[PDB]
């Protein structure tokens, strides 16, 4: 943990928080990309982030495509 940031949007959190959490963590890791250091970002279940975003798009009544995911 001396070198790790842990960004957590769990299964009970709101779907916009789970949708935003990989962008939140990428922005924290882009601090090290932008200052000459090196980052390592892990998006654990990016398949769970698309399901959270599918929830927000269907609740916004946007038209679903293949497997009811948005375009």
């Amino acid at each position: 943990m001396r070198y790790t940031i842990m960004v957590s949007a769990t299964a009970s959190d709101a779907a916009p928080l789970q949708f935003l959490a990989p962008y939140s963590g990428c922005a924290m890791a882009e601090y090290f990309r932008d200052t000459g250091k090196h980052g390592l970002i892990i998006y654990d279940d990016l398949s769970k982030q698309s399901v959270a975003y599918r929830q927000m798009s269907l609740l916004l009544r946007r038209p679903p495509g293949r497997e009811a995911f948005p375009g």
Partner: protein
């Protein structure tokens, strides 16, 4: 296109129960033919200790018999001894001899013509349809003595267990066309025996090698028939796996199409409702 994938699961599920029926059809036929192949193994033993075993002789004329199956879900059994035919039919020719190639079993004429069609002269089939008897194997032997070679070659699969079928070459020399001519070294190996026949020793050996031909032919097409059921059993096991692996990939493909057509029909319904509301 959701019925084409559903009718293929109709096919592979019926195949995977056909081929599991043929697995145990061949399994029960392997066991009641093992009680006939062990009783028949005795009579080949005195003729190989009386006359010995001489595969590589320089015969002038030979009759080679590759005894195969009639039905062909065997799994490369009828091809392995067609392969072992030319492995011995190129080996024992060191002088340019006559060879008559014979096949017992209907799957032999279709594969021996592919290698030797100019030496293939006889085709015995329909052998195992009722059973294999010695009188039947006698008549097959008497048709082989119409041609008189100096040697006979019988190529068959020896049923060792349900797993291993090591093929055998069993050789029968004609009675003094080569047979006593191979024992007579510094005397004779056959002259130890006191002949109790009606006529001459050269005449009883004429009787004795036809009987040695009919015995090792009766064993050959009884060893091979029990080796055929035990390779169909291993072939029909490998095809129920292949029809279970294919059925598993089709059911994953069907569930994906089942989920996709429920999503597709629902998106069509909501789009038609949102166009009105």
């Amino acid at each position: 296109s959701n019925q084409a994938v559903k009718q293929r699961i109709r096919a592979i599920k019926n195949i995977g129960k056909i081929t599991k029926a043929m697995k145990m059809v061949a399994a029960s036929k392997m066991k009641n033919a093992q009680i006939a192949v062990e009783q028949s193994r005795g009579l080949v033993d005195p003729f190989v200790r009386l006359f010995g075993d001489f595969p590589a002789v320089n015969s002038n004329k030979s009759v080679v018999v590759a005894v195969t199956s009639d039905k062909g879900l065997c799994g490369g059994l009828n091809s392995n001894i067609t392969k072992y035919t030319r492995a011995t039919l190129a080996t024992t020719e060191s002088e340019g001899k006559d060879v008559v190639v014979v096949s017992i079993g209907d799957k032999g004429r279709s594969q021996l013509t592919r290698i030797e069609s100019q030496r293939y002269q006889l085709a015995i089939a329909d052998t195992y349809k009722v059973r294999v008897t010695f009188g039947q194997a006698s008549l097959i032997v008497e048709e082989l003595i119409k041609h008189n070679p100096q040697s006979y070659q019988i190529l068959f699969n020896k049923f060792r267990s349900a797993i291993s079928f090591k093929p055998t070459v069993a050789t029968i020399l004609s009675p003094d066309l080569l047979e006593k001519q191979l024992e007579d070294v510094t005397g004779n190996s056959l002259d130890a025996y006191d002949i109790e026949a009606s006529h001459e020793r050269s005449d009883v050996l004429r009787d004795l090698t036809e009987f040695h031909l009919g015995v090792t032919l009766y064993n050959a097409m009884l060893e091979n028939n029990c080796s055929e059921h035990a390779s169909r059993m291993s072939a029909m096991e490998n095809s129920t796996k292949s029809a279970g692996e294919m059925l598993g990939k089709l059911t994953l493909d069907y569930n994906r199409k089942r989920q996709a057509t429920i999503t597709t029909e629902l998106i069509e319904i909501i789009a038609g409702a949102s166009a009105l509301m």
